[PDB]
Amino acid sequence: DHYEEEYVLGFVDKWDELIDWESRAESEGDTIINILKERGVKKVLDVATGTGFNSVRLLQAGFDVVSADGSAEMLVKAFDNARDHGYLMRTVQADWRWMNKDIHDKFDAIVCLGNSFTHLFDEGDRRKALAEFYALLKHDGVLLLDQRNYDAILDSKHAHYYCGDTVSVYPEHVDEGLARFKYEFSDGSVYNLNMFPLRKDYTRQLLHEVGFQEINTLGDFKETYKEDEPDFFLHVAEKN
Numbered sequence: 001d002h003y004e005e006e007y008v009l010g011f012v013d014k015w016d017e018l019i020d021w022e023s024r025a026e027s028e029g030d031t032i033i034n035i036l037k038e039r040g041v042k043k044v045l046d047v048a049t050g051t052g053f054n055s056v057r058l059l060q061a062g063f064d065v066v067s068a069d070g071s072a073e074m075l076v077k078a079f080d081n082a083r084d085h086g087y088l089m090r091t092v093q094a095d096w097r098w099m100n101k102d103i104h105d106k107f108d109a110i111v112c113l114g115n116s117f118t119h120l121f122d123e124g125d126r127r128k129a130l131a132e133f134y135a136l137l138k139h140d141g142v143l144l145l146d147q148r149n150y151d152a153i154l155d156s157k158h159a160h161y162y163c164g165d166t167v168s169v170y171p172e173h174v175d176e177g178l179a180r181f182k183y184e185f186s187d188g189s190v191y192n193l194n195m196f197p198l199r200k201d202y203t204r205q206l207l208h209e210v211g212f213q214e215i216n217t218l219g220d221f222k223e224t225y226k227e228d229e230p231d232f233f234l235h236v237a238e239k240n
């Protein structure tokens with residue numbers, strides 16, 4: 001099991017090596033930040049910190065951020081990336097399924113970004129993870145959760161490029177239960193990743209079913225060469 005972890009740690013290293021956060025931050029809107037700002041959000045819990053891009057973006061915007069992740073190794077990279085940008089990250093190692101075990105506060109908002117939720121292959125785990133997020137939200141809190149547009153693939157199979165042509169993402173295999181993407185970087189590096197191909201309405205169903213009163217799903221065009229369909233969706237789920 002130590003190889004899968006090592007394989008993905010190599011992947012995110014390669015991603016951050018070749019894709020600098022300043023370009024990424026210019027490309028990603030200020031939409032997410034504005035959404036939190038216009039809701040008066042102060043406390044944010046990042047449950048998919050990875051190497052810390054979302055967290056650092058929110059610290060720079062002035063939010064109080066708690067940075068969680070299942071991986072201690074990711075969190076070390078996150079903390080030092082934050083350190084480099086001049087911020088003190090507050091890291092907590094936690095699994096989405098018992099988020100409650102190490103986190104003892106409630107939040108104005110939770111972010112789960114970068115197509116993260118897709119890493120769960122069991123519906124039971126999906127429900128639990130969402131219920132954990134929901135309990136961690138204040139009564140008026142909000143969950144921001146994104147995903148790739150898998151509907152586009154399931155129903156026209158080609159590569160998608162990010163940060164110009166720095167990395168290409170190609171669907172090698174996609175069925176209802178699994179999407180395998182080939183990632184190729186500009187320096188020649190190739191990584192192959194499995195994730196669960198969530199349909200837009202299916203995620204929405206899950207969110208509405210664990211208790212979220214209202215859900216707005218935004219189309220998000222992140223790829224270099226844009227198509228009629230968005231390559232991402234952002235779910236904005238209000239607890240009320």
Ligand SMILES: Nc1ncnc2c1ncn2[C@@H]1O[C@H](CSCC[C@H](N)C(=O)O)[C@@H](O)[C@H]1O
Nearest residue numbers: 048049050069070071074095096113114116
């Ligand atoms: N069940 C789980 N509980 C807690 N963290 C999990 C998890 N499953 C996956 N993760 C974490 O979710 C992360 C996905 S990577 C996302 C990085 C960041 N959001 C960005 O956009 O750059 C990984 O770092 C991984 O360790």
